[PDB]
Ligand binder design. Structure first.
Ligand SMILES: CCCCCCCCO[C@@H]1O[C@H](CO)[C@@H](O)[C@H](O)[C@H]1O
Ligand SMILES: CCCCCCCCO[C@@H]1O[C@H](CO)[C@@H](O)[C@H](O)[C@H]1O
Ligand SMILES: C=C(O[C@H]1C=CC=C(C(=O)O)[C@@H]1O)C(=O)O
Ligand SMILES: C=C(O[C@H]1C=CC=C(C(=O)O)[C@@H]1O)C(=O)O
Lengths: 207, 207
């Protein structure tokens, strides 16, 4: 009862297909965190292999640049086997959710965390919710957030909104996210570019 | 430089045009708060009069039922004349924002707050952000939230998401909200019904 629908293959958007950004922010490595959002085996299994492959190749490219440039890396991941109390109203849309087993909860090996990277717990749509993401960013002097991962219109977008709300400038990497469908993905970008982030492609980040 | 686009008249959705709810929550007055979200003069002036009139008539109907049934009423409102620091990244999409003058910041008279109603400050998209909404709901023993107001896809939706995330069951009143366009409004409902709320009409609440 995952609540996650059948996902049909679609192309990741190119720079030419992105909506116009209304903001004018510019990414500075020294100010930034890369949020690798919910790239757990359980959340990537629903993706068709072509989409999975495109997503993980770009996120990996992105992560390597970030490490080379001194961008702080952060992963969010659900603990798995949430208690009823922990699960709360996620139950109603998404069932009991993934198990606390390596097969479900592991970050996929192509994005394997390194010793210096932050490991944050995901409870709800926003990566900041009941995590110490905000506190860590403040204590690290980092006020920009680069987002990649899944699902574009759900946790990725809501995390973007929350960062924005905390006066943290977000950069949503349009082809290093994936979603339930092309339309969901496109609408997440449209929302971001006009309401809370700079929408960019992986190449655009790498310059 | 409000950032608010020209809004063209459109009909509020009827029960038959609503997306299917995936949740099964049921509103109990004793558990609930009615959030009258950003119904300030400044935010309603961009609406064409037909849309304004439909919105305020349904919100008023809703508020009267809520009072008759013992539902706690709460208003959110921006202080106006935000400092640069207070305004933060809202500046980039929405300019300096409304003034701290009655002409901008007042709740519209058709929804005039009463002495028992909560007055909460709005800073960002989510009504909970830097307000004491959550704290008050917890201390009042209320764990359901009925939302009306503007703009459907921005603060109304993000507030709905935040309530949901705090295991507070939301009820989004589809024809007691308004938005930048019909498509924005419809997509907010689609999002809500499948991700964070029961979507209902004013009549459906009044039974
Ligand atoms: C910016 C993001 C915009 C998303 C607009 C609608 C998002 C919710 O879309 C929902 O997806 C479900 C499949 O998961 C469908 O079954 C629902 O009918 C549909 O409304
Ligand atoms: C669930 C809510 C879905 C909204 C999908 C897109 C929302 C943002 O829509 C934006 O509205 C602007 C006018 O304000 C347009 O100028 C932008 O081009 C458009 O992308
Ligand atoms: C990958 C996300 O997880 C959520 C979305 C679908 C299923 C979930 C679950 O089973 O818990 C999440 O709540 C995200 O927030 O985008
Ligand atoms: C009515 C809202 O205010 C926001 C939306 C547009 C302009 C705003 C402003 O000028 O501050 C808000 O940030 C809402 O969150 O939906």
């Amino acid at each position: 009862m995952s609540g996650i629908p059948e996902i049909t293959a679609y192309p990741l958007p190119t720079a030419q297909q992105l909506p116009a950004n209304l903001a004018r922010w510019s990414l500075e490595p020294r100010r930034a965190v890369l949020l690798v959002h919910a790239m757990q085996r359980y959340f990537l299994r629903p993706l068709p292999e072509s989409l999975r492959a495109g997503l993980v190749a770009n996120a990996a490219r992105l992560r390597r640049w970030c490490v080379e440039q001194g961008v702080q890396i952060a992963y969010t991941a659900q603990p798995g086997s949430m208690t009823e109390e922990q699960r709360g109203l996620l139950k109603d849309f998404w069932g009991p959710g993934m198990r606390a087993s390596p097969a479900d909860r592991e970050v996929v090996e192509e994005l394997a965390p390194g010793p210096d990277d932050w490991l944050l717990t995901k409870w709800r749509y926003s990566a900041f919710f009941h995590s110490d993401l905000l506190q860590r960013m403040r204590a690290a002097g980092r006020d920009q957030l680069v987002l990649c991962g899944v699902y574009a219109h759900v946790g990725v977008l809501i995390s973007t909104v929350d960062a924005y709300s905390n006066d943290i400038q977000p950069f949503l990497v349009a082809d290093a996210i994936a979603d339930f469908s092309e339309a969901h993905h496109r609408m997440a970008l449209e929302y971001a570019a006009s309401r809370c982030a700079m929408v960019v492609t992986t190449d655009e980040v790498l310059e």
